[model samples]
Target: TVTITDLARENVRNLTPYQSARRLGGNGDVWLNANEYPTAVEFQLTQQTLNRYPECQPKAVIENYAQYAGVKPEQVLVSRGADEGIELLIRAFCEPGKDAILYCPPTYGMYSVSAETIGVECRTVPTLDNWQLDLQGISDKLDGVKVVYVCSPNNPTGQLINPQDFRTLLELTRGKAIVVADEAYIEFCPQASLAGWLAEYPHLAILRTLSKAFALAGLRCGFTLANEEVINLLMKVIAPYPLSTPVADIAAQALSPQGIVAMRERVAQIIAEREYLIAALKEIPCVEQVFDSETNYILARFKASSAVFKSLWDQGIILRDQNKQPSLSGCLRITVGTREESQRVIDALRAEQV
Candidate 1:
């Protein structure tokens, strides 16, 4: 029922994806297709686990995630990371030069960058005053657009898009374009995902990642959930061996029972610590405002964020300076690190007064 011609330009619907090392083929019993990895590595005193190719969307990994996310295996497509998923969606829907991808600013930078790099026109509709989607603007801009990217618990801003607004956008763009809800920070805000709505809305796609909460930034594992047809189309654009063996193995291990429990514990800690950090930030004389956050990070506007950033850097503390982003002119994004790390930031801020 869904056709690319109805939404995307002909070029994107017919792109030839790049071929990689694994695409050519190599025979092995431990095969898991593209998500391959080396068995072991030697460190200063410790020897790491070795042997076998990691599973590509391994049953164990996908099952655990499905259990946690409440989605079925058929609904998920794992990627190198959410970054790869973003790129994949662009490849699947937008044609270079001819079609465009839409994004709301004061959101993630990668959405615009990825489309631009692929030669797709990147359209922008700045966020409304409350950092919510500019629906009217989006409706006005959908004329030749093939993809619309909305990030809830939006990067740097730390605010989640209202669920009603998201549904409105979905209904409005139902057959005209794909609405990608980048819920990379969803773990930090459980009730906000549009993942469950995929069955009802064929054009809705959700992007999620373990990099942020799973402490697997190095593993580069992320998942894309959409209808099977959308998944098949993306397959055409993905490299055969897109994921390395070790990356897949690490991801598989991370999704294990023990791994899931460990991650949940960590999430609880991070949420608690995030609240503490928010309270501490508000205590600082220079911190002007702290936005409500459903993510692990807090977006705080300071009297002079550049100065705050420099002071933090001098003390070996690093936080994102979001002053360059529209609507976030004096804001700084601080991730909820360990309690000790959080304390160090508090101490540094206290020292800034003297």
Candidate 2:
């Protein structure tokens, strides 16, 4: 008798699912493992139409988000989350086994996972020591590459890709491949967003999420900003009712002008807490180096990360372990939590030195 695993597709048979933060659950009082907004936000769900199927793309969400991102409504495509946006791009553009998707190292993991799940090639070109793009390496690796994912203010590293390098990438892949700028953390560093260049580079696509700065990760709402042509092609491949009624309603409200102000206030508070955590870490004897972040998290190398990670974990201060990622040996990623939570991390480390 054949087993269930044997019946699954070749790609799905032995694939290692992306180890998300929640999947690697921890019993911590201060949960800074995931780069989630520390504060919980509440929004009233006004949709009473659970009996009815949701729209393929809610007009309110698309229009409001387009207005917020300063793009045409036709250029925005709403989906389950930025994760879905990644899958949609691969599904619509790439031919399984024949085409490939490329991403830089110590970046988001979903880009590769999504590609593998769809039976497409997932290519990786590690970044430079400074955690910036290897433009020359990328240029050389473009053969049969259809989608290139670049995360600015990148996850894990929290460093922004050089703008000049990005511009060169766009020009190089203009008609060759789609260059997706994953801007999940763009709210923390709005000045570095490439949203404004949608018109200049038709091949450029952007992924935005309500998960981080908006404190709406639970809502599963995200947007893809691209040229009208790319948006139209993606819509053809997207599900008919991608978002539930409640999600669409809450997402639209989050994109409202008042909602944006609240998000900005939350961002400012996190920024302050991040600075405080960075300053305190630098003074700590065990912290070898603290990477400056433009996102809501900091990546720090410790004298003995295995000991530091365990000590903090024992004290119920959970953080993401970046030890497995390339060039991040002895480094751990800590999401900025409340002022008190940051204090817990600092105090926890100080106690170890005693």
lDDT of 2 by residue, 1-354 (tens): 999878899889889999984433456689999899988899988989899998889999999999888999999999989999999999999999899999999899999999999999988899999999999999999999999999998998998999999999998898899999999999999999999998899999999999999999999999999999999999999999999999999999998999999999999999999999999999998888999899999999988898899888877888888898999999999999999999999988888754
Which stretches in model 2 have alpha-carbon errors above 4 Å?
21-26
Ten-residue region with minimum lDDT total, candidate 2 = 20-29
lDDT of 2 at 113: 94
Candidate whose lDDT is highest: 2
* Alpha-carbon runs more than 4 Å astray in model 1: 1-59
Candidate 2, backbone clash total: 0
lDDT of 1 by residue, 1-354 (tens): 987587976545655443223321232222211211112211131214435454445665667777768887777788888889999998988877788999999888788767866878889999998899899999888877999999987886788999999989998898889999998888877777888888899998889887777777657789888888887788788876666666665666777677778777777877898899899989888888899888778888888789987777655676677788898898887877777777887887777753
Best by TM-score: 2
Candidate 1 worst ten-residue window by lDDT: 34-43
